[PDB]
Amino acid sequence: RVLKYAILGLLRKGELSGYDITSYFKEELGQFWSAKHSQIYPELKKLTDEGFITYTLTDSGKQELHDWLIRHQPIPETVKDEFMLKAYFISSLSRQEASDLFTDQLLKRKAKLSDLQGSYEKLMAPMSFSSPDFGHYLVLTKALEREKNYVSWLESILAMID
Amino acid sequence: RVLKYAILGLLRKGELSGYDITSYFKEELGQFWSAKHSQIYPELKKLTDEGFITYTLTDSGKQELHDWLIRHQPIPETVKDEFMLKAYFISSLSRQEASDLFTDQLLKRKAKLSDLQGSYEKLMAPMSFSSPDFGHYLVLTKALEREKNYVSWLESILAMID
Numbered sequence: 151r152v153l154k155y156a157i158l159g160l161l162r163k164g165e166l167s168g169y170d171i172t173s174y175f176k177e178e179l180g181q182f183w184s185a186k187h188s189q190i191y192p193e194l195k196k197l198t199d200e201g202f203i204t205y206t207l208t209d210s211g212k213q214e215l216h217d218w219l220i221r222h223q224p225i226p227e228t229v230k231d232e233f234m235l236k237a238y239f240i241s242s243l244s245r246q247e248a249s250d251l252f253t254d255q256l257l258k259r260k261a262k263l264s265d266l267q268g269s270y271e272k273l274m275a276p277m278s279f280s281s282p283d284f285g286h287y288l289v290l291t292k293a294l295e296r297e298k299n300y301v302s303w304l305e306s307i308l309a310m311i312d
Numbered sequence: 313r314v315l316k317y318a319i320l321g322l323l324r325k326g327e328l329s330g331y332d333i334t335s336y337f338k339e340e341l342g343q344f345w346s347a348k349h350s351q352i353y354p355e356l357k358k359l360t361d362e363g364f365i366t367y368t369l370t371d372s373g374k375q376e377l378h379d380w381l382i383r384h385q386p387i388p389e390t391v392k393d394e395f396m397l398k399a400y401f402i403s404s405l406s407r408q409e410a411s412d413l414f415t416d417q418l419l420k421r422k423a424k425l426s427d428l429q430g431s432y433e434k435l436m437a438p439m440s441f442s443s444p445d446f447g448h449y450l451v452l453t454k455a456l457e458r459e460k461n462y463v464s465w466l467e468s469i470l471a472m473i474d
Protein backbone atom coordinates (compact mmCIF):
# COMPACT_ATOMS: atom_id res chain seq x y z
CA ARG A 151 0.00 0.00 0.00
CA VAL A 152 2.92 2.28 -0.80
CA LEU A 153 0.71 5.02 -2.32
CA LYS A 154 -1.88 5.23 0.50
CA TYR A 155 -0.44 8.25 2.29
CA ALA A 156 0.98 9.95 -0.81
CA ILE A 157 -2.51 10.04 -2.26
CA LEU A 158 -4.20 11.10 1.00
CA GLY A 159 -1.55 13.81 1.27
CA LEU A 160 -2.14 15.05 -2.28
CA LEU A 161 -5.82 15.56 -1.49
CA ARG A 162 -4.95 17.51 1.67
CA LYS A 163 -5.38 20.88 -0.08
CA GLY A 164 -8.81 20.01 -1.57
CA GLU A 165 -10.49 17.94 -4.33
CA LEU A 166 -8.65 16.40 -7.29
CA SER A 167 -9.66 14.19 -10.20
CA GLY A 168 -7.65 10.99 -10.85
CA TYR A 169 -5.94 12.53 -13.89
CA ASP A 170 -4.84 15.40 -11.59
CA ILE A 171 -3.39 12.83 -9.09
CA THR A 172 -1.67 10.98 -11.96
CA SER A 173 -0.34 14.37 -13.15
CA TYR A 174 1.06 15.14 -9.58
CA PHE A 175 3.07 11.91 -9.66
CA LYS A 176 4.64 12.99 -13.00
CA GLU A 177 5.91 16.21 -11.34
CA GLU A 178 7.91 16.76 -8.10
CA LEU A 179 6.18 14.12 -6.01
CA GLY A 180 7.42 11.44 -8.47
CA GLN A 181 11.10 12.28 -8.00
CA PHE A 182 11.15 10.91 -4.43
CA TRP A 183 7.92 8.87 -4.32
CA SER A 184 7.43 7.40 -7.73
CA ALA A 185 4.23 5.57 -8.53
CA LYS A 186 3.59 3.06 -11.27
CA HIS A 187 0.44 3.98 -13.25
CA SER A 188 -0.94 0.47 -12.47
CA GLN A 189 -0.83 1.23 -8.69
CA ILE A 190 -2.79 4.49 -8.61
CA TYR A 191 -6.36 3.62 -9.52
CA PRO A 192 -6.29 0.40 -7.37
CA GLU A 193 -5.14 2.49 -4.42
CA LEU A 194 -7.88 5.04 -5.18
CA LYS A 195 -10.39 2.14 -5.15
CA LYS A 196 -9.11 0.87 -1.78
CA LEU A 197 -9.14 4.33 -0.24
CA THR A 198 -12.77 4.89 -1.33
CA ASP A 199 -13.69 1.44 -0.01
CA GLU A 200 -12.04 2.28 3.33
CA GLY A 201 -14.05 5.50 3.82
CA PHE A 202 -10.95 7.73 3.52
CA ILE A 203 -11.88 9.43 0.24
CA THR A 204 -15.16 9.76 -1.72
CA TYR A 205 -11.86 12.72 -5.17
CA THR A 206 -11.98 14.55 -1.81
CA LEU A 207 -10.75 13.51 1.64
CA THR A 208 -13.45 12.54 4.09
CA ASP A 209 -13.15 13.46 7.79
CA SER A 210 -11.93 9.89 8.19
CA GLY A 211 -9.21 10.36 5.54
CA LYS A 212 -8.03 13.58 7.19
CA GLN A 213 -7.74 11.82 10.54
CA GLU A 214 -5.90 8.86 8.95
CA LEU A 215 -3.43 11.25 7.28
CA HIS A 216 -2.96 13.27 10.45
CA ASP A 217 -2.36 10.12 12.56
CA TRP A 218 0.30 8.94 10.17
CA LEU A 219 1.95 12.38 10.02
CA ILE A 220 2.51 12.58 13.76
CA ARG A 221 3.43 8.90 14.29
CA HIS A 222 7.03 8.34 15.36
CA GLN A 223 8.37 5.31 13.49
CA PRO A 224 11.74 3.54 13.78
CA ILE A 225 14.29 4.43 11.04
CA PRO A 226 13.95 1.69 8.48
CA GLU A 227 16.59 -0.75 7.27
CA THR A 228 19.12 0.78 4.97
CA VAL A 229 18.15 1.20 1.27
CA LYS A 230 20.10 -1.19 -0.90
CA ASP A 231 22.49 0.85 -3.02
CA GLU A 232 23.81 -1.49 -5.69
CA PHE A 233 26.88 0.74 -6.23
CA MET A 234 27.79 0.26 -2.56
CA LEU A 235 27.60 -3.51 -2.88
CA LYS A 236 30.20 -3.19 -5.60
CA ALA A 237 32.31 -0.99 -3.35
CA TYR A 238 32.03 -3.67 -0.65
CA PHE A 239 33.54 -6.15 -3.13
CA ILE A 240 36.24 -3.71 -4.34
CA SER A 241 38.99 -6.34 -3.66
CA SER A 242 37.88 -8.04 -6.88
CA LEU A 243 38.77 -4.92 -8.97
CA SER A 244 42.14 -3.62 -10.01
CA ARG A 245 43.04 -0.13 -8.94
CA GLN A 246 42.40 1.06 -12.47
CA GLU A 247 38.96 -0.65 -12.64
CA ALA A 248 38.05 0.81 -9.27
CA SER A 249 39.04 4.24 -10.51
CA ASP A 250 36.91 3.83 -13.67
CA LEU A 251 33.87 2.65 -11.68
CA PHE A 252 34.11 5.40 -9.05
CA THR A 253 34.77 8.08 -11.67
CA ASP A 254 31.66 7.02 -13.61
CA GLN A 255 29.63 7.13 -10.38
CA LEU A 256 31.03 10.58 -9.51
CA LEU A 257 30.07 11.92 -12.96
CA LYS A 258 26.53 10.57 -12.57
CA ARG A 259 26.03 12.00 -9.09
CA LYS A 260 27.33 15.40 -10.16
CA ALA A 261 24.97 15.23 -13.17
CA LYS A 262 22.02 14.43 -10.88
CA LEU A 263 23.08 17.31 -8.67
CA SER A 264 22.95 19.77 -11.59
CA ASP A 265 19.37 18.60 -12.37
CA LEU A 266 18.40 19.17 -8.74
CA GLN A 267 20.06 22.61 -8.75
CA GLY A 268 17.89 23.57 -11.78
CA SER A 269 14.80 22.48 -9.87
CA TYR A 270 15.89 24.49 -6.80
CA GLU A 271 16.45 27.62 -8.85
CA LYS A 272 12.99 27.34 -10.35
CA LEU A 273 11.37 26.83 -6.92
CA MET A 274 13.29 29.73 -5.41
CA ALA A 275 12.59 32.23 -8.26
CA PRO A 276 12.14 34.29 1.00
CA MET A 277 11.68 30.75 2.37
CA SER A 278 10.17 30.08 5.76
CA PHE A 279 8.14 27.50 7.66
CA SER A 280 5.06 29.57 6.72
CA SER A 281 5.65 29.40 2.94
CA PRO A 282 3.15 27.15 1.06
CA ASP A 283 6.16 25.72 -0.77
CA PHE A 284 8.01 24.70 2.41
CA GLY A 285 7.26 20.99 1.83
CA HIS A 286 8.66 21.15 -1.69
CA TYR A 287 11.73 23.03 -0.36
CA LEU A 288 12.24 20.25 2.23
CA VAL A 289 12.25 17.39 -0.32
CA LEU A 290 14.44 19.33 -2.76
CA THR A 291 17.06 20.50 -0.20
CA LYS A 292 17.12 16.96 1.26
CA ALA A 293 17.89 15.60 -2.24
CA LEU A 294 20.50 18.33 -2.82
CA GLU A 295 22.25 17.58 0.45
CA ARG A 296 22.12 13.82 -0.18
CA GLU A 297 23.77 14.06 -3.62
CA LYS A 298 26.33 16.71 -2.48
CA ASN A 299 27.27 14.36 0.32
CA TYR A 300 27.57 11.40 -2.08
CA VAL A 301 29.78 13.46 -4.42
CA SER A 302 31.98 14.48 -1.47
CA TRP A 303 32.37 10.91 -0.29
CA LEU A 304 33.18 9.76 -3.86
CA GLU A 305 35.82 12.45 -4.24
CA SER A 306 37.40 11.35 -0.96
CA ILE A 307 37.51 7.69 -2.02
CA LEU A 308 38.91 8.51 -5.44
CA ALA A 309 41.78 10.43 -3.77
CA MET A 310 42.54 7.10 -2.03
CA ILE A 311 42.20 5.07 -5.21
CA ASP A 312 44.17 7.46 -7.45
CA ARG B 313 17.24 -11.83 -7.73
CA VAL B 314 18.42 -9.26 -5.21
CA LEU B 315 20.94 -11.63 -3.56
CA LYS B 316 22.62 -12.91 -6.76
CA TYR B 317 25.66 -10.64 -6.68
CA ALA B 318 25.90 -10.38 -2.89
CA ILE B 319 26.29 -14.13 -2.72
CA LEU B 320 28.70 -14.34 -5.69
CA GLY B 321 30.69 -11.56 -4.02
CA LEU B 322 30.81 -13.36 -0.67
CA LEU B 323 32.35 -16.39 -2.35
CA ARG B 324 34.97 -14.21 -4.04
CA LYS B 325 37.60 -14.98 -1.38
CA GLY B 326 37.08 -18.78 -1.54
CA GLU B 327 34.66 -21.56 -0.50
CA LEU B 328 31.88 -21.15 2.06
CA SER B 329 29.12 -23.39 3.40
CA GLY B 330 25.52 -22.08 3.39
CA TYR B 331 25.57 -21.53 7.16
CA ASP B 332 28.71 -19.39 6.63
CA ILE B 333 26.83 -17.33 3.96
CA THR B 334 23.82 -17.01 6.29
CA SER B 335 26.25 -15.94 9.05
CA TYR B 336 27.80 -13.22 6.71
CA PHE B 337 24.36 -11.68 6.19
CA LYS B 338 23.91 -11.43 10.01
CA GLU B 339 27.13 -9.34 10.22
CA GLU B 340 28.24 -6.21 8.29
CA LEU B 341 26.88 -7.23 4.90
CA GLY B 342 23.34 -7.27 6.40
CA GLN B 343 23.44 -3.63 7.52
CA PHE B 344 23.33 -2.34 3.92
CA TRP B 345 22.21 -5.44 1.99
CA SER B 346 19.86 -7.33 4.21
CA ALA B 347 18.64 -10.74 3.16
CA LYS B 348 15.58 -12.60 4.36
CA HIS B 349 16.49 -16.18 5.40
CA SER B 350 13.83 -17.45 2.93
CA GLN B 351 15.73 -15.83 -0.01
CA ILE B 352 19.19 -17.31 0.53
CA TYR B 353 18.89 -21.02 -0.18
CA PRO B 354 16.61 -20.42 -3.25
CA GLU B 355 19.24 -18.04 -4.62
CA LEU B 356 21.94 -20.63 -3.88
CA LYS B 357 19.85 -23.17 -5.83
CA LYS B 358 19.49 -20.81 -8.82
CA LEU B 359 23.18 -19.94 -8.82
CA THR B 360 24.15 -23.65 -8.85
CA ASP B 361 21.62 -24.29 -11.61
CA GLU B 362 23.10 -21.42 -13.64
CA GLY B 363 26.67 -22.80 -13.48
CA PHE B 364 27.93 -19.86 -11.36
CA ILE B 365 28.63 -21.83 -8.17
CA THR B 366 29.03 -25.57 -7.41
CA TYR B 367 29.90 -23.61 -2.22
CA THR B 368 32.70 -22.27 -4.46
CA LEU B 369 32.59 -19.90 -7.44
CA THR B 370 33.09 -21.52 -10.81
CA ASP B 371 35.07 -19.74 -13.55
CA SER B 372 31.65 -18.78 -14.88
CA GLY B 373 30.62 -17.26 -11.52
CA LYS B 374 33.85 -15.26 -11.33
CA GLN B 375 33.26 -13.86 -14.80
CA GLU B 376 29.60 -13.04 -13.97
CA LEU B 377 30.71 -11.20 -10.80
CA HIS B 378 33.49 -9.38 -12.62
CA ASP B 379 31.15 -8.29 -15.46
CA TRP B 380 28.68 -6.87 -12.98
CA LEU B 381 31.43 -5.10 -10.99
CA ILE B 382 32.71 -3.14 -13.97
CA ARG B 383 29.29 -2.41 -15.54
CA HIS B 384 28.32 1.26 -15.51
CA GLN B 385 24.62 1.50 -14.62
CA PRO B 386 22.34 4.56 -14.46
CA ILE B 387 21.70 5.93 -10.93
CA PRO B 388 18.42 4.39 -9.87
CA GLU B 389 15.20 6.14 -8.90
CA THR B 390 15.29 7.71 -5.51
CA VAL B 391 14.70 5.44 -2.47
CA LYS B 392 11.36 6.19 -0.87
CA ASP B 393 12.01 7.74 2.51
CA GLU B 394 8.70 7.73 4.35
CA PHE B 395 9.88 10.54 6.67
CA MET B 396 10.43 12.74 3.61
CA LEU B 397 6.90 12.11 2.38
CA LYS B 398 5.74 13.49 5.70
CA ALA B 399 8.02 16.49 5.28
CA TYR B 400 6.49 17.04 1.83
CA PHE B 401 3.07 17.25 3.51
CA ILE B 402 4.32 19.47 6.37
CA SER B 403 1.51 22.04 5.67
CA SER B 404 -0.86 19.63 7.44
CA LEU B 405 1.14 19.92 10.73
CA SER B 406 1.24 22.73 13.22
CA ARG B 407 4.59 24.27 13.93
CA GLN B 408 4.68 22.43 17.23
CA GLU B 409 3.83 19.06 15.60
CA ALA B 410 6.47 19.64 12.95
CA SER B 411 8.99 20.38 15.67
CA ASP B 412 8.07 17.17 17.55
CA LEU B 413 8.30 15.04 14.39
CA PHE B 414 11.64 16.50 13.25
CA THR B 415 13.11 16.34 16.76
CA ASP B 416 12.19 12.65 17.02
CA GLN B 417 13.80 12.03 13.61
CA LEU B 418 16.94 13.95 14.64
CA LEU B 419 17.26 11.86 17.82
CA LYS B 420 16.94 8.64 15.81
CA ARG B 421 19.50 9.64 13.20
CA LYS B 422 21.99 10.72 15.85
CA ALA B 423 21.37 7.38 17.62
CA LYS B 424 22.04 5.48 14.38
CA LEU B 425 25.17 7.56 13.92
CA SER B 426 26.51 6.54 17.35
CA ASP B 427 25.98 2.84 16.41
CA LEU B 428 27.90 3.39 13.17
CA GLN B 429 30.69 5.21 15.05
CA GLY B 430 31.07 2.14 17.32
CA SER B 431 31.38 -0.06 14.25
CA TYR B 432 33.99 2.30 12.73
CA GLU B 433 36.07 2.30 15.88
CA LYS B 434 36.10 -1.48 15.95
CA LEU B 435 37.10 -1.69 12.26
CA MET B 436 39.83 0.91 12.70
CA ALA B 437 41.36 -0.61 15.89
CA PRO B 438 46.36 2.71 8.54
CA MET B 439 43.66 2.50 5.85
CA SER B 440 44.47 2.36 2.16
CA PHE B 441 43.18 1.00 -1.13
CA SER B 442 45.46 -2.02 -0.52
CA SER B 443 43.94 -2.94 2.87
CA PRO B 444 41.83 -6.15 2.82
CA ASP B 445 39.24 -4.22 4.83
CA PHE B 446 38.93 -1.38 2.28
CA GLY B 447 35.50 -2.62 1.12
CA HIS B 448 34.18 -2.67 4.68
CA TYR B 449 35.67 0.83 5.25
CA LEU B 450 33.83 2.04 2.11
CA VAL B 451 30.37 0.82 3.21
CA LEU B 452 30.88 2.07 6.78
CA THR B 453 32.20 5.56 5.87
CA LYS B 454 29.40 5.87 3.27
CA ALA B 455 26.85 5.11 6.02
CA LEU B 456 28.59 7.53 8.42
CA GLU B 457 28.57 10.32 5.88
CA ARG B 458 24.94 9.63 4.93
CA GLU B 459 23.67 9.85 8.53
CA LYS B 460 25.91 12.87 9.39
CA ASN B 461 24.44 14.61 6.37
CA TYR B 462 20.88 13.70 7.41
CA VAL B 463 21.51 15.01 10.94
CA SER B 464 22.93 18.26 9.50
CA TRP B 465 19.94 18.76 7.23
CA LEU B 466 17.53 18.03 10.14
CA GLU B 467 19.29 20.55 12.36
CA SER B 468 19.00 23.16 9.61
CA ILE B 469 15.27 22.54 9.16
CA LEU B 470 14.60 22.58 12.89
CA ALA B 471 16.26 26.02 13.12
CA MET B 472 13.60 27.10 10.57
CA ILE B 473 10.77 25.39 12.43
CA ASP B 474 11.81 26.55 15.93
Ligand SMILES: O=C(O)/C=C/c1ccc(O)cc1
Nearest residue numbers: 178181182269289290293390
Ligand atom coordinates in the same frame (compact mmCIF):
# COMPACT_ATOMS: atom_id res chain seq x y z
O1 LIG C 1 14.72 12.92 -4.15
C1 LIG C 1 15.08 13.22 -5.31
O2 LIG C 1 15.97 12.62 -5.99
C2 LIG C 1 14.50 14.39 -5.95
C3 LIG C 1 13.67 15.21 -5.32
C4 LIG C 1 13.12 16.40 -6.01
C5 LIG C 1 12.20 17.14 -5.25
C6 LIG C 1 11.60 18.28 -5.77
C7 LIG C 1 11.90 18.72 -7.06
O3 LIG C 1 11.29 19.85 -7.52
C8 LIG C 1 12.81 17.97 -7.84
C9 LIG C 1 13.42 16.82 -7.32
Ligand SMILES: O=C(O)/C=C/c1ccc(O)cc1
Nearest residue numbers: 228340343344431451452455
Ligand atom coordinates in the same frame (compact mmCIF):
# COMPACT_ATOMS: atom_id res chain seq x y z
O1 LIG D 1 24.47 1.23 5.61
C1 LIG D 1 24.29 1.14 6.84
O2 LIG D 1 23.32 1.64 7.49
C2 LIG D 1 25.29 0.47 7.66
C3 LIG D 1 26.43 0.02 7.16
C4 LIG D 1 27.43 -0.65 8.03
C5 LIG D 1 28.56 -1.14 7.37
C6 LIG D 1 29.57 -1.79 8.05
C7 LIG D 1 29.48 -1.97 9.44
O3 LIG D 1 30.51 -2.61 10.07
C8 LIG D 1 28.34 -1.50 10.12
C9 LIG D 1 27.32 -0.84 9.42
